[PDB]
Paper text:
Lipases (triacylglycerol acylhydrolases, E.C. 3.1.1.3) are water-soluble enzymes that can catalyze oil hydrolysis, esterification, and transesterification. For the first time, we have cloned and heterologously expressed the lipase from Rasamsonia emersonii (ReLip). The functional analysis revealed that ReLip has an optimum acidic pH profile and was active on a wide range of substrates from short to long carbon length chains. Furthermore, ReLip is highly thermo-tolerant under extreme conditions such as in the presence of methanol.
Crystallographic analysis revealed the closed conformation of this lipase indicating structural properties driving substrate selectivity and tolerance to organic solvents. As expected, the catalytic triad of ReLip consists of the residues Ser177, His290, and Asp232, which are fully conserved in other lipases and esterases. ReLip possesses three disulfide bonds (C67–C72, C53–C300, C135–C138) that are also conserved in TLL. The C53–C300 disulfide bridge is connecting the N- and C-termini, and is adjacent to the other C67–C72, conferring high structural stability to ReLip. The three-dimensional structure of ReLip confirmed the presence of a helical amphipathic lid, indicating that interfacial activation might be involved in ReLip mechanism of substrate binding such as its ortholog TLL. Indeed, in the crystallographic closed conformation of ReLip, the substrate could not be accommodated in the active-site cleft, supporting that a conformational change is required for substrate binding. ReLip conserves the residues isoleucine and tryptophan, but the residue phenylalanine is replaced by an alanine. The lack of this aromatic residue in ReLip might be associated with the preference for shorter acyl chains compared to TLL, while preserving the ability to cope with water-insoluble substrates. Another singular feature of ReLip is the presence of a salt bridge formed between Arg291 and Glu118 from the lid subdomain. The presence of this salt bridge in ReLip implicates in a higher protection of the hydrophobic pocket to bulky solvent, which can be correlated with the high tolerance of ReLip to organic solvents.
Residue numbers in the entry: 31 to 90, 92 to 124, 126 to 135, 138 to 141, 143 to 301
Amino acid sequence: RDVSQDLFDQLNLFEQYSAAAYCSANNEASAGTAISCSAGNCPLVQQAGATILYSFNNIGGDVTGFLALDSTNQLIVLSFRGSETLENWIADLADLVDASAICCEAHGFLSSWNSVASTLTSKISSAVNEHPSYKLVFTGHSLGAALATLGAVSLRESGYNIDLYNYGCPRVGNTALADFITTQSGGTNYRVTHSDDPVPKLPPRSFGYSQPSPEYWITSGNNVTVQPSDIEVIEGVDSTAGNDGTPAGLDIDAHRWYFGPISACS
């Protein structure tokens, strides 16, 4: 209802970034190589001239993705990849840890993050000292999506202006953490959901988990081209509308589809 064309194109661009995080060619690639996607999984960034600044594969959980520069759109993107074995990853997905360093407490996710955190923050600082006029964006899909969200909420403690673009992100922490992510003056947050996606539903909210807002929920089905008319914004934090309002189930093909097959390049 309330979404523009250029913002829709930005959402598609960052979902294609998250999809390029799946390409094994873009992972562990030598710095300086351009971003390429098998089966045109990301032609909007592949034709945007994004250069790989760093590519990481298996560090810490399975932290995999790339930090890249985009001078056509003038921004530095840190995109995390989900899980190579996503169906084995959704099975053991519900422990909670004490994450009062941001507080209120988060979920494995923060484990892998704080494992890669010092090195990735050093590289991010170098990249943003390179181009101080570029926007810092963290993004990802599924597991990586979580690694993106926390990955931002732990770097806004410093004077970092970070925009977040998660696709099919699970729940990371309590309701206080959702409120903190919702109310933060260090950049805007774009949480994207799609249909009967069981990944934003898990871990269950009964067990203390909660997801922040706004929720950008697309009404399009699986394996179907999407239009901005199908995208609705949801304002209530931890709202039973959109994805969380969809009934229980395991529509994994709905999690496979986010503006295109986001997980099909590994």
